């Protein structure tokens, strides 16, 4: 039900005018926290987090991620010498956070990846850092020496859970706010094949069921989707296409199932799509 995620990236080759280190925070899949190596500051991204937290909160977050930036800077140099790699593109990825399931079960996660492949993963049930690759064994030796397993256990089970419950309470109005999609039905004729398209513009929340219907019957297999893609303002977009015969286009209807709609919305090409209200 409720999730807290901290997405960290350390790069050797980021690109021109782009930061090498990026740290972003998410509450229920929505961005709220942001940090980059160029700005060197932890800043809010939503109105609900900024209005409910003071400057003292963002100061503690800045110094903790500034240190994380320095630690990951060392990690890129340590792992390149360990793997005996000579230049090129190398990436260190970090994933941290906790899930508060609807039944009350708490799941904790703290794992890393080197060059897009699993490196280390903390196992909460055994209190040990699992080394996925043979090059991740000296990392486990450093962890067993320091004894970070106990300090990480109390964070994922108590600290992470406490603050996620606060963020859920702060952003309850925004996360639960439903947004109706602007639907449009289109068609393209090519080599005796009529490709019908159905686009849903700016919907919230993210889960949606957009299906094609022929003579009032669902055509799941024949329909091709592009997945749920995000918009810059926070809303989502999706498109579903179907191959049909020319002169049969009006027999097809677009069905949209969403939380903002009390009943599934039916749309046709000739009726004007979403302009039919």
């Amino acid at each position: 039900l409720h999730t807290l995620r901290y997405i960290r990236t350390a790069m050797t080759d980021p690109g021109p005018g782009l930061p090498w280190f990026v740290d972003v925070g998410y509450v229920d899949g929505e961005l709220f926290m942001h940090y980059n190596s160029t700005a060197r500051r932890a800043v809010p991204r939503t109105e609900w987090i900024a209005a409910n937290t003071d400057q003292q909160y963002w100061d503690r977050e800045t110094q903790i991620v500034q240190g994380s930036e320095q630690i990951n800077r060392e990690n890129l140099d340590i792992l390149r010498r360990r793997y005996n790699q000579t230049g090129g593109s190398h990436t260190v990825q970090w994933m941290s956070g906790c899930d508060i399931l609807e039944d009350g079960t708490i799941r904790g996660y703290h794992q890393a990846a080197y060059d897009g492949r699993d490196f280390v993963a903390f196992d909460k049930g055994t209190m040990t850092l699992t080394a996925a690759v043979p090059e991740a064994v000296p990392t486990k030796r450093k962890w067993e020496e320091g004894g970070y397993a106990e300090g990480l256990k109390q964070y994922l089970e108590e600290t992470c859970v406490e603050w996620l419950r606060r963020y859920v309470e702060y952003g309850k109005a925004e996360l639960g706010r439903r947004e109706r999609p602007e639907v449009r039905v289109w068609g393209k004729e090519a080599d005796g094949i009529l490709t019908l398209s159905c686009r849903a513009h700016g919907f919230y929340p993210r889960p949606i069921v957009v299906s094609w219907l022929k003579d009032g019957a669902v055509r799941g297999q024949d329909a091709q989707s592009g997945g749920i893609v995000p918009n810059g303002d926070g809303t989502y977009h999706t498109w579903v296409t179907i191959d049909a015969q020319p002169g049969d286009g009006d027999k097809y209807q677009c069905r949209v199932e969403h939380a903002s709609l009390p009943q599934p919305g039916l749309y046709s090409w000739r009726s004007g799509g979403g302009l039919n209200d």
């Binding site: 990951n72 703290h110 990392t139 450093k142």
Partner: peptide, 10 residues
Amino acid sequence: YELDEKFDRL
């Protein structure tokens, strides 16, 4: 609330 920098050590 982010976790301490020492837990990012490799």
